[PDB]
Design a protein around this ligand. Structure first.
Ligand code: H6I
Ligand code: H6I
Ligand code: CL
Lengths: 237, 249
């Protein structure tokens, strides 16, 4: 069985402020860095070896990957970065905390966005405080005008993440390369939804743990042979 | 027409033991990490931007690159690693200090090796304590038997670094991508000798500072407009270049 490992990054600087990050490039907090260290040590203790790594273009995921590669002494591995593994774009909610979001948009709309698979948050418009910071960041300069989001539902995030899974990661797995993916909750949710054939309701009920190596065993058709498993001592899990 | 930046990593844990590292994967010391941070901050303060980065498969260079990318807020850049940018392979000298090398191999051979462009150190044989650690590391599993060195003169190092420059780096430069290369003294010497047309004698004497960004302005044919220039406070650079010139002497 092919072996695939996923890791979701840990706590970020804006988690501490209860602020929606999305495509804002928030760094890990010291605690999120420590989580990545512990996940890397769990991989080292289990003897895991990789051949290629994939991550987003967001530093909280990239730094998680760097920390893991340092812990497992595989800093020399090829690394591929792609915006398609980015966190969901939270649109006009970017940079707001919970209270500001409730005050600006109302409890009704908040519950809609919270529980909906396919209703996006408001768009990030040119007067938004983070519009230039994100939409004019040169790391997205090669995206076409229809690819750069102003906002994303979970459905949207999964829709632009899965082409990268299908067209780049799958061929690598099929040639026997041992893949590590360090990314974000919602983009990894896309991968999990696809691997396991989950419903919209099922994937919205799925919260992946942070900082914990998530291990899949895949058959010749890249179908999981059993549920995802977690690495680390039992209490940390 | 084009701008190119090189950075040589700083002190490693084995430098503090006065031991030959070569392809041994020694990590940075605190001082080596600090030099990377200062080079990154120099690039940040001058507003430098890159589009692609090249480094070796050795962590002292990779960690220097990581520290620079952190400092300049460009951790999202594509990074390409290659053994062809590795440090010179010191063969059987790997792991030895200067006294042990002199005792084992003689002052006569030491003098030859240190002054010579094309006489390699002794081969690292299977009984060498670091043979399995280096020659059987899976990161080199895809190298042909002819590509995997047992030892390298400076000429050998340059001969395997320049194919990567010509095949992988030059096309990125010609596309207009702003390239950063974070590597090692001897592989960077290959790039410098090629760009500036220096003699063997001059490239073996050339002072290559650690942790100081090295900047080239190149014309459309990739010829330097001026020789390498150094980024950073003038007095810090001046003192650093006096230091390396003194170490050469
Ligand atoms: S996202 O990165 O997965 C995310 C980040 C923070 C919170 C959530 S959520 O609570 O699961 N969903 C959500 C909540 C809210 C508000 C709650 C209290 C005031 C605003 C707004 C939007 C969302 C959402 O679109 O997911 C998810
Ligand atoms: S290498 O990393 O560039 C290097 C490191 C230390 C010293 C040199 S060298 O003096 O220029 N050349 C050299 C010296 C020696 C010894 C000196 C005293 C005892 C052994 C051995 C080999 C070399 C060499 O291969 O160039 C270079
Ligand atoms: Cl990297």
């Amino acid at each position: 069985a092919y072996k695939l490992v996923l890791i979701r990054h840990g706590e970020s600087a804006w988690n501490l402020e209860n602020r929606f990050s999305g495509w804002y490039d928030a760094d890990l907090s010291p605690a999120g860095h420590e989580e990545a260290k512990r996940g890397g040590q769990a991989l080292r203790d289990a003897g895991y070896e990789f051949d290629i790594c994939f991550t987003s273009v967001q530093k909280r995921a990239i730094r998680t990957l760097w920390t893991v590669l340092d812990a497992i002494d595989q800093m020399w591995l090829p690394v591929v970065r792609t915006w398609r593994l980015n966190e969901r774009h939270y649109g006009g909610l970017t940079g707001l905390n919970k209270a500001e979001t409730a005050a600006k948009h109302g409890e009704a709309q908040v519950k809609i966005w919270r529980r909906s698979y396919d209703v996006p948050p408001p768009p990030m418009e040119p007067d938004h405080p983070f519009y230039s910071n994100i939409s004019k960041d040169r790391r997205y300069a090669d995206l076409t005008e229809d690819q750069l989001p102003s906002c994303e539902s979970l459905k949207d995030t999964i829709a632009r993440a899965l082409p990268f899974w299908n067209e780049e990661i799958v061929p690598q797995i099929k040639e026997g390369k041992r893949v590590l993916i360090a990314a974000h909750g919602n983009s990894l949710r896309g991968i999990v939804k696809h691997l396991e054939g989950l419903s919209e309701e099922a994937i919205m009920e799925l919260n992946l743990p942070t900082g914990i190596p998530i291990v899949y065993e895949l058959d010749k058709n890249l179908k999981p042979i059993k549920p995802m498993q977690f690495l680390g001592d039992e209490e940390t899990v």
